[model samples]
Target chain A: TVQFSLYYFGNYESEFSHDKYNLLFAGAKYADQHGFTAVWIPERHFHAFGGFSPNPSVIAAAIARETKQIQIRSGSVVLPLHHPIRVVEEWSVVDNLSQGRVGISFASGWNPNDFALAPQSFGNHRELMFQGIETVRKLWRGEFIQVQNGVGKSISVQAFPRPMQAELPDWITVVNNPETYIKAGEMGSGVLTNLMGQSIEDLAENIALYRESLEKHGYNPASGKVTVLLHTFVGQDLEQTREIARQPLCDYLKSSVALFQNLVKSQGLQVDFDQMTADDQDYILSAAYNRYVQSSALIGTPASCAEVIAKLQAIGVDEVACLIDFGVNTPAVVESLPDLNALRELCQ
Target chain B: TVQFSLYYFGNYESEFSHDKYNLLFAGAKYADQHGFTAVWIPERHFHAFGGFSPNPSVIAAAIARETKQIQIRSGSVVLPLHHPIRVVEEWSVVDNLSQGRVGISFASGWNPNDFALAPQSFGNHRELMFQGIETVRKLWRGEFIQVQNGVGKSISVQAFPRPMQAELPDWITVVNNPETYIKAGEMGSGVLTNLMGQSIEDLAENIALYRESLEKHGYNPASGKVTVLLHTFVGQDLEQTREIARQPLCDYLKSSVALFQNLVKSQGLSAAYNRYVQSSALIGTPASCAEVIAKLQAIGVDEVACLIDFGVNTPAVVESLPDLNALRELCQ
Candidate 1:
């Protein structure tokens, strides 16, 4: 039997605005009814996403109240950006609401522009991310300690609503980086990989590296978990699936292009988005896309998708986190539920 | 216009369990839809509540996703009991979710049993609560600072998802404590008072003291906010309301009585639970409830609660919020 976990990523920009909450609630309620293992909400600040969701914990509480079975996860809350104590308290409340069915994904963050907006400078985001997690874990267990600087004060504190789970399950989402993988191993946390440019061999190598690091760090390799995230959509037929997934597909590719363009422009990188052609798209839609969909996503017909998934299971990948709809309109995604239901049944 | 806030007391233990989320969501959604300004969740650990709601941020996030226009608040998150960083990050996310409509009520915590269960010592809870808030505020702004003795790691860091609101709205829920009142004033935060054993006149005096302290501490007296939490309920008629509200009322009282009994038994205190009955538990009809709430408002309690969870989840209180909503409409 495979341990299957389905995760949904909600854009804080569009979903958390007061006007969007009704729609957001509809999505959350649907996710709950569908029995998703977890719902992942991303943390982004002051971007085109309208900066509506400033606090994930507040939203998590609301979701915790609304949902019953699904675990609420902070799909990589930018940790280097905030104080660890507040994270402890907020998650404590979230843990209380969800009855310990809470998990967090931590990130040092890559957006220097976003970091620059903060009152403080995180010279090395990764270092802060690692330290923040250590501090928060201890605080969650109600440890007493003193803060160093006169700028901040500390004392022995315990988080309220200790997680229902013995220790909060933690995952680190890695994006083309070995540092995160090393840190995840060192921390004994789960790993969520985004295989954008990486090949199967590359991913395998990374996994092997992670396992070795975990073992070297004195962690149980068997206890360490990994989940891959991929953009996926399911439909009744190939034609309808292509039609429904087109807009989101274009939107996602365009967004990635725009992000890459910005990164290239800002960081003086040599990569050029314009150099990519339909062939590149095809390659992305074939080797990487097909392999990921078969392994990480539940797209296409249930039987077909399940058959693909079986291959992933054979490859030592038991848990699959399908990114159901990305950059797509909610109505389109909502309309695809019947197909999703069928796929879910097949996966079951 | 009267600033109104809704308060939720988890009479049932482990109320945040998966089975109970629907009920909690229903109450929160109702509060939001009805135009309640804020919703308050209590923080208690290891009791019958089973400490299931370990993090209010998760609940706050759910509520933020469920409703717009209403603020999500933790009615005293037991600040002394938590690490400040966790509070900052979680609430920062919540503040982001609500578009800056997140506020927290801080408590030093009075339960000794909770202290034993947690890593905190009862004696240091107060200092920790005060410092925890200070640290959270700094973290919310994305400031870098180091902690001594390897307690909190050094952070040349910034926090993401800065509060949507300019300043994080904070309130200190105190029980006849002058120091907390002064501290809240000094911090320019709001105050939540439960006049458990004090008279209305005493509450007025305390409010005056807070205002004076705020002025002394460089805060504008008129700008500082105070919320008075009282036991409140409403029904169709006085008699029916009393009858239906009785069981939940007694249950709520019994929980408090248990608290008082434990305190008395363990600490050998002179006061008893029977002595607290009249001072707490504000039970009556809409008119009577309004009158009491109005009186509290007159004495510097700009925010009032017309309904609270009275142990039992009574249909009367659930239905009565709309009535109060109508009353507010009429007043407006």
Candidate 2:
């Protein structure tokens, strides 16, 4: 049997609006009841689609209160965009709520537009991300220390409601980046990768590089875990799955492709979403299924998906996270919960 | 209609508990429906009464989500005990949740037992409190800058979901301290006072000092707000009110007395809770209650507590909050 971990990508604009908090709560309760290991929330600022979860810690608190066993993880808290103390304090509360079942992922946010809105300079993103994570770890340990070299003066301070976990679990998400991988290994934090376009061979090579660096740095290579995220879906029949999933899968592709195109354009490089498409409407699904999704995602019947997962487990990649709900309407997501639950039972 | 601000002091041990989060939510909603202007929550640590609510920002978020219009104030976040960055970020979320209706009161936490648990050193409490408040103010402005003089190498940082209010309302809860009053004047933040053991005349004199300090510091006295908190109760029938209130009131008095006595024993102070009670406790009918609160207003209390549910844990005090709300209207 392979061990699996699952987390939601959001309490996003789709569900976390002031008008939609109740719906978000309903979704959280559903996930908790279904024995999902964790709910992953992302941090987005000032967008209508991402409006409700600017502060993932606050959302985590609500989810913690509403659920019993499920863990709460900030899919990636943009550390460079926030003060470390605030992150530690908020998560401290969540940790207290969950009785120690909180995990966090840190990111040196990629959106320069988001950086420009803040008073802090953007050049310090990587350095700040590293320091912010360090500060949070220290604060969670309940020690009084001076927060050094930031925009504010140093005063010895401690954070309260110390987390129930012996120490907070910190994870850093790397996108084919070696600097983040090396830093994550150096700090003994978990590494997560998003292999959007990378082949399995590429991932395997990167994992080997990460393990080599971990050992070279005198850290336990086995201690530094890695999780890969991909778009996925499952249904009673392939026809039913494709029909219900087409629009949402398309939307996810369009949004993701647009985001990547924008990133590339901002960097003064030339790339378009059209070049990344497989076909008109079936572009993302077809490409994703053929390349990464079939192997990376948990899809199709339980037996088939389980077999794929077992193979991955055999190769030291047993921990699978199913991203089945992205861009789906709430009612539709609720309808598909049974299929996802059935898949989870197969993993057991 | 009278505009009255009743500060609901949520005693962590007595009222709020992890298992009772739903009950706490119901209580806040109840207060909101009955026209309570704001609810005050304290920041406490390592107590058996409630181990939860270690961070009021978390609680503030919940309260903001559960109600509309009622302002949420951390009666006084124990600033000396926390990192200022954490304070700024969490409350920024609270401010967003409440749509700019968040106010915070800072406390230079006095409990050594509590102070010992965190990274805070006992000797640096006052300095940390001042610096923490200053850092929070800057972060709320949503600007980027390098903070120096403490923990690590300087890195640029900012608070996301910047406060909806142009400036978040800030106040300092003082315990008859001239220095804190002076600090509040200099900072131009509001003042919250618990008139324990001080005579009305003494409170008036302190308020006068605060106003004078405000002018001395070149701040407009009118802008230097003052709120006085006291244990309060009211009922339609006076006999039934006091009768029902007796046990909870005594419990409140006893605990307070014990706290003060312990402090005196440890610090060799001369004050006691019995003396404190005689000067505080704003209990009576609407008309009479209105007179007492109006008296405080005349003495430069920009805010008056017509009701305080701190230790009055009985259903009667909960029952009397609406009456006190009525009295506040009558006073206005």
Candidate 3:
């Protein structure tokens, strides 16, 4: 059976204590004290693509101190943009603060604006992202990894403030790449995927490819983790869930064509914004939202969510990184924590 | 009179609960609930300089969440070592997490290894450090600052996790130099200095230079702050205070030469080691600490950041917090 997890992507902008972090902080605290296994935060930038959290590790640092048991994590720390040394150094401190209760997922980011911090890496982001992820592992495991320092010379460096976990759990994230599934399996890494661009059949096929690739690479296929991200909601009924979460969620997708048109030039994609009619765009987005509500999503009451979760388990998902802020208000999302926790029991 | 603060150089390296953080974490918490003005952390890398706080702001993040009132801060973040964007971004997040209760002191970093991450800036680090500091101010003030995204183009970026404080407090640190004082004054920044590398006479002149330069530059001399660092200890008996703090603090001084010698070939100066139980340190009972604070106030020191991590045993430092808290009463 698939286990459960919760994640957040700052759906709407709000003030710090008011909405900025209160939802994140409160949701995470409840997850820590309650039954949810882990709470994930994403690294977003510039535009309000996500809420206000641009740096997940910094937010993780705050959560590390505030939470006691739940694993504090970066949903996917974009690796190529940072010095790998910094990635190791920063998270090692979090590990220490959380008493070794932190983990990170590495991603080859898609946004050119997001890669603005390390412009040099955008072209070779995947290569650098993988290399940096490897570098972080070696540094964490007490290896004298040679790193470039102040003088442009390569010198060996070892990390300190040793992590509480001998080897912190790691995952390689894939948005729509099935090849990444085989690659992630080959690297003996846990796999993180989403139902964002891919259909359920494609997701299952991709995951199956990962399991096969793991065994072909001489690793235990069953041992590899498959964490999937999906839009989630739990409420008194289906109508109420959609009542509160609909606009934000639709507003979430309605801006996709608008959002991607701005990014298409930088990503070198043929996304036709001038070609996308407002009616055409809304139809495409509403279709995605309907597909989510009908099958892929875990929205509705606990028993109804349990039905969707079992279907996910059959597809070999080990955990659902239930993204709570798809189009919902912050308070409404946090207010659903107890209801979400109830799904863990009902699904089991 | 100068207010009292506590600072750490990560002098002690142990495991999480047994190490520098727990001791500092407990001290900072007490400082928040009690009367300490601020808690400071230094950025030391490669080796455990103060304990294992490689990034002061990261440690400050934990402190910001853990403590409520006492200002959470970076004693000195090595500015030239990072992108001005990163320096601003990191601390701004800290400022938000602390509810605008955070401050940063910028330093023209000293370690070659420290500069290694951003080696190109090492040659003109001081210029870049000042430039970066100014850049941070403009960005915080809501300027659409164009910064390099490490790829090739300069994209304009605005800070998020906007801080609670409208204009956050900041300082430019100096060591054994009067020029930086004038420069900091010209930049309209506060002054951060220490007793190491100079005598009390030189420190006094440097603050005077800082204040005088502010006035000469047509800024209010009183507008700039003067925070000084001192190695501190408080006990019931002055003799016992020295008896306990002597070796570890000296052990601390001995390794500074070691930690930095390795780091400098990677910057500018060399490192040193000595029987650091020198007469210069402000070690004694609370009364003696009080006397030194009085003298520091005479030199126009607005705040004193007491260095407590060097060579001190972890348990001893933990034990010393109560007496140190009492000294705050004495100083106040």
> lDDT tens string, model 1, B123-228?
6678778887887788776665344222223334444445566677888887666777787888888888764445566678778878888999888787788887
Locate the minimum summed-lDDT window of 10 residues in model 2 chain B: B262-271
Model 1 chain B: lowest-lDDT 10 consecutive positions: B266-275
Per-residue CA lDDT of model 2 for A1-348, tens digit only, reads: 444455555433332233345345665677688866666767766443544566688777767767888777887788876657667767876776566778898988866655633335376788888887988898888777664322233456666555667788878877766767677777888776654545455566666777777888888766767766655566787556655665665455557655444333323333345655445435434444343335655556565566666655554553455564566666666666677678778877
- How large is the C-alpha RMSD of every model relative to the true structure? 8.7, 8.4, 4.3
- Scored by lDDT, the top model is 3
After superposition, which runs of candidate 3 have C-alpha atoms over 4 Å from their true positions? A11-19, A48-51, A258-276, B13-20, B49-51, B148-153, B256-280
lDDT: the better of candidates 2 and 3: 3
TM-score of chain A of each: 0.81, 0.83, 0.90
DockQ of 2: 0.14
- Summarize candidate 1's per-residue lDDT along A1-348 as a digit string, tens digits: 344444445443353244444435566677667755676666655443423344566666677767788777776678866667557766766776677777888877775644532324356677777888898888766665345222233434455444456677888878556767777888898887654445444556667777778989999888787766655677778556655665555445446655434323333234435676767655443343334444434556666666755655554554566665465666766776666556656666
lDDT of 3 at B178: 79
- Model 1 preserves the real interface contacts to a fraction of 0.29
What ranking of all candidate models by DockQ puts the best one first? 3, 1, 2
- Best DockQ among the predictions, by candidate number: 3
Ranking by lDDT: 3, 2, 1
- Candidate 3 or 1, higher lDDT: 3
Which scores higher on DockQ, 2 or 3? 3
Q: Fnat of the models, one by one?
A: 0.29, 0.13, 0.55
